[PDB]
Amino acid sequence: LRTLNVKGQLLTKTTMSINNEDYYLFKFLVNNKSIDYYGTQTQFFSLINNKTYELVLQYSRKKLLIKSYEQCEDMTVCKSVTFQEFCANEIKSLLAKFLYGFKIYGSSNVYKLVFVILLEDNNGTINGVQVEMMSDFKRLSGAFKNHVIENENDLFDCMYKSEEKYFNLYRIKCNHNANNYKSLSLSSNSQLERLETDDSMFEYEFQYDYTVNISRSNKIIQKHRVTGNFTSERNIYQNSDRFVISYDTANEKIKTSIYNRMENAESKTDYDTSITLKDVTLSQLNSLIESNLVQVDVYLVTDPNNVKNNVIAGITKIEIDGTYEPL
Amino acid sequence: LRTLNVKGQLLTKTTMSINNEDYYLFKFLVNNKSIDYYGTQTQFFSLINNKTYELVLQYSRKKLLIKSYEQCEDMTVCKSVTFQEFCANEIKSLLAKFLYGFKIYGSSNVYKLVFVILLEDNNGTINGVQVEMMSDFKRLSGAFKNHVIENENDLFDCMYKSEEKYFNLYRIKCNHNANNYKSLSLSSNSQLERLETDDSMFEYEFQYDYTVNISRSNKIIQKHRVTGNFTSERNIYQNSDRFVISYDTANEKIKTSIYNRMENAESKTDYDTSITLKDVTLSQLNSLIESNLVQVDVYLVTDPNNVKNNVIAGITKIEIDGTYEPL
Amino acid sequence: LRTLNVKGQLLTKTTMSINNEDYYLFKFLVNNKSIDYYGTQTQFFSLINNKTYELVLQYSRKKLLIKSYEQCEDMTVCKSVTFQEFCANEIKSLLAKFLYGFKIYGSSNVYKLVFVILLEDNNGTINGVQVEMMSDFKRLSGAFKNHVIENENDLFDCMYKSEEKYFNLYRIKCNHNANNYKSLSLSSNSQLERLETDDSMFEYEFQYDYTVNISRSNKIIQKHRVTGNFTSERNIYQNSDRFVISYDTANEKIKTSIYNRMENAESKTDYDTSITLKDVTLSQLNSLIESNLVQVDVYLVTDPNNVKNNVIAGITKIEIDGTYEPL
Amino acid sequence: LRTLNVKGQLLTKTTMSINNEDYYLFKFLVNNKSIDYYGTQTQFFSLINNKTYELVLQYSRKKLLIKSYEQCEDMTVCKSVTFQEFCANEIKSLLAKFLYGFKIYGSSNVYKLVFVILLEDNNGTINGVQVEMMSDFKRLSGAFKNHVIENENDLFDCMYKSEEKYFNLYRIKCNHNANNYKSLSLSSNSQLERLETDDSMFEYEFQYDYTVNISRSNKIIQKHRVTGNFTSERNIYQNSDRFVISYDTANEKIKTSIYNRMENAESKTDYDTSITLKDVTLSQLNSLIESNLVQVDVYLVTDPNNVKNNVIAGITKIEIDGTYEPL
DNA sequence: AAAAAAAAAAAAAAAAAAAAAAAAAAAA
């Protein structure tokens, strides 16, 4: 049984059970590539996160796994991104601004964070724009550094407690859609760190102001806090199934319109039941708000010039208990 | 668990099943706004429709739901509408005339009723005009009062049995399209009631005569009963896919032309298969008619001055069995 | 379940699949009218084309369909058409000359054949003129007799292999446009047959010479074979978007000009992308021709007296492989 | 106890134990139909495979079983198949070419072989195309002739040792899916034989070249040998759970994408655990390859014209030991 | 059953409507 030697960082330990057997996996970063390895219980407790190691691996029982480890020792993050870098789809690190993050409405697990990043145009000037980092739940939970996340409430806590704080993003895969839509993405070997600025630098916060968003066409995602009435009328048309919504911020009336479809792997009855549960939840939401049982934040895809289209990106509910209801 | 108290009408009880669990929803009208609440089985059987209630609600298990109820007790309907009211898009009640209702041709569920209402112009005179209340199937089924509807056959029965009868419309949202097109719409908290006139008043039926329609430009929807031949030739042109139809009423030859398109969420093969099923159905329709197996009613958008355009709005089939084939 | 009995020809069997179910349709000609019927798999294989049948039909499961069939047994074609017959828009049969057929340039499926027919004027003399039978692809594929067509290559093969041959046209609906434009059209129950003359009669081929065309105003469609250079310069003007083309036949320089518009159901980006793909295809066409990779036939609407207007009707490409590129 | 007499081939003897009792079954081919019979231990050892017999059967103890047997004595295989034969779903024999066979990725037992067969089109010419014979493990093990198979390693040995060899297929049920997908299937009474050509005929091997595959739409399954890096990034989207894979053949970079779903009889935790085991296996696969511990063959559903879709059909691992790891 | 499938932006709807010839544009 020949062995291998490898030096690399660790990212996140994980355990699981299959047919009355226990597997312990370690997500070691080797040569800037994520590779998972098997380990024992002492390996599970002993190893700490984000600290590099040296390992000997022996291919026993069909699998590579950790035989022995030795503690070892080992960051520069770009403050801007070039248009050509987004074109080239090159993995990168960044210093960005974490605005706010919501669970995409009517989606099981695909959360979405909003980041302000300094984009450098073809001319060469750097300005702060908006980007939308989608991510599944587990990748987000295992990607946050210096935090421990087990359920959606923990994720929402780590979001809200960190609102407006400055994030260091490690190995966020930038990508460029078919049209001129630019967005980050959170890869397995990627990580997020709260920089804990405490006004360490203030000369940069002037730059981090968003006038447009480069992930959508002429639209920006903004957060509103629902103050008063929340009317939500379903409207089934010949083609679409809209949710025409009108609500009251602290400043202005807002007229949004959620949309609906049947996903390809859905049935006529499952989709209809899910939609009617959504509708009853929205209907009860107004009475819940007026009596201060819950508070509601609506992150909507507004178009400041043309308010004819204001599709809600996602709704979230901060309850009196303290748990967060995704919705 | 703090509680709320609310007095309001009930509209329609409903039950559903999600992953081996039962949800019972009640569509309570609170402060002239539809709000749905959860309930138990005894709540489902005990409560009757259209009868108001007093309720105590307690926010348990993420949801508002009915804890206890107390029977309580509690209509003026406008006989006309103002042009400015259509402009303002104000919800309203009405006394209208139910001409006839058809399932929009080549549409899964968006039925359409035809109503005669007394419109008051800018001058101030009231005359009877035509309006087109579209609605999805379930809203129609839950909106009819003193009727029980479970399937399309029940809906068509409630329509045909009520032809030419006078309807009281509660909270029908009037609306005004981009151009001078005016139409009703059936909101969640809206209802329809057969007034059961029995010639209670006849001095008003003189007014309810339609010379034009305010939902289309210079066109009126009329019902014809197909007597003789029903020729239906498909004609695929450079731009359109017409269905040139010629048929025989009890009075006159009619030369209509159905149209076709691919809806945005459709494929080149699904649309083609749907169209060829439509074509084979129309082709068999003539032989079906001539042998008295079925009877056919064609509601067409005629223009009495200019018969160059007679797009069929919808076809319906009354079979020998008694069921209604939408088509 | 009462039944019907009917004797009629069959035209074309067809099969299709809808949500994991199979429909088999037979296009039976009953009383000189096309009617489609449903059938089973043995019905699909057993029945042969163009051979009449006797059928018993029973209205089961919402649909007329074939229960049993019995083999049965059963043409005079007019050699001329009267001006009044074109005026009256009367369906008719004909003996005509198939010149050539092209896919209308920049059109998804509306092919167009060119026929020489003997028109009888108001005076009473019969002379050979040109007519333009448009047709969608599937009607053409199902309309050719003694041929099997599945894709555009088969259609082009059936055209080119039959060039200059004499066609018997069954039930071609003649029609007369708003102005003095006369054209055939290919109805569902219509058919085309290669007569296979083999110089059966030659005294008639003297008549079949076209001096004008009755589907256009003073213009005739003619086929040219591109020999040398094919220059194609786009020219976007204040109103039109021309494609000024100059090419070299075996005899003469030709200066055509294709035109462009946005169809009503098109977008500013889709139309522009389609146009630039057309332009790159035309630009590469010259280099393709000069190296004998493909051969090109241009059917253009020439006006022999006035060459100031020579709009190309359609281009077609015979490749080295043998497949036909519509363009 | 009346008895029966029957003459038929034998296919595969089998033994099993139920509650401390032994059952011995013989898969006798009677009148080209598989029928299983019970027997005794001497029956188990005495009878040889593929050799016909005469048997007397007596219905004792609820079951037909072999009382006595007498040795007896008894093939023409079609070299082509007609399109109509695939349409008719008729069992058939064939002479085909065994390309390669893999265990369908993420499937417990449904292996899949790839065969080149001479299809005769509607025109009448015979050309070599690709077909995909799925089969469960035990049917494959009992279907191979002149081979003994007990575990997956034996099956993979019988595959790889027989790569590119010519197979005689007995009673392979051809079938035709809803769309134009044509595929073989391995029935109980079906068998496979290595013909052992040894260049017996070479004039036919020119025909056996695959340009397309008739079991998929415009795609062909091909085998690649992974030479260098094997990157496998999981990507959980709003709808799909892709495994975007990039690897290095001996010639070209390849960008495949495995897909994932929850089968209907699966749970949210079992599916997630299975997927994360798949992901850790793929992650370790690269390090395994680079150190020559294992070799990897990826059979992928490529589309040569459009590489935008390259779903891996199946991965297989040839280890240094000699055993084959299915994966 | 097995093939197919990059997502993730963008989206008021719902009236209206024979088509298919014709045409050089740009000055004034």
PDB file of C-alpha atoms (C1' of nucleotides) in Angstrom, chain C residues 20 112 134 216-217 219 238 240 242 259 261 309, chain E residues 1-2 18-27:
ATOM      1  CA  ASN C  20     -46.521   9.558 -22.980  1.00  0.00           C
ATOM      2  CA  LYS C 112     -43.020  28.556 -52.914  1.00  0.00           C
ATOM      3  CA  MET C 134     -46.918  29.165 -51.704  1.00  0.00           C
ATOM      4  CA  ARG C 216     -47.039  39.761 -59.901  1.00  0.00           C
ATOM      5  CA  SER C 217     -47.351  43.059 -61.767  1.00  0.00           C
ATOM      6  CA  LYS C 219     -42.570  40.696 -63.377  1.00  0.00           C
ATOM      7  CA  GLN C 238     -33.422  56.173 -43.785  1.00  0.00           C
ATOM      8  CA  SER C 240     -35.222  50.500 -45.961  1.00  0.00           C
ATOM      9  CA  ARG C 242     -31.377  46.773 -48.661  1.00  0.00           C
ATOM     10  CA  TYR C 259     -35.072  43.864 -48.836  1.00  0.00           C
ATOM     11  CA  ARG C 261     -38.061  44.525 -42.381  1.00  0.00           C
ATOM     12  CA  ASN C 309     -36.098  46.393 -59.636  1.00  0.00           C
TER      13      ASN C 309
ATOM     14  C1'  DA E   1     -39.841   3.921 -19.220  1.00  0.00           C
ATOM     15  C1'  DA E   2     -35.574   6.424 -21.042  1.00  0.00           C
ATOM     16  C1'  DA E  18     -56.651  38.918 -44.865  1.00  0.00           C
ATOM     17  C1'  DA E  19     -51.856  38.784 -47.188  1.00  0.00           C
ATOM     18  C1'  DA E  20     -48.516  39.656 -50.412  1.00  0.00           C
ATOM     19  C1'  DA E  21     -47.364  42.171 -53.723  1.00  0.00           C
ATOM     20  C1'  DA E  22     -44.771  46.725 -54.265  1.00  0.00           C
ATOM     21  C1'  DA E  23     -40.379  49.639 -53.484  1.00  0.00           C
ATOM     22  C1'  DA E  24     -34.120  53.850 -55.131  1.00  0.00           C
ATOM     23  C1'  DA E  25     -33.033  57.511 -52.180  1.00  0.00           C
ATOM     24  C1'  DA E  26     -32.291  61.656 -51.318  1.00  0.00           C
ATOM     25  C1'  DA E  27     -33.078  66.064 -52.333  1.00  0.00           C
TER      26       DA E  27
END
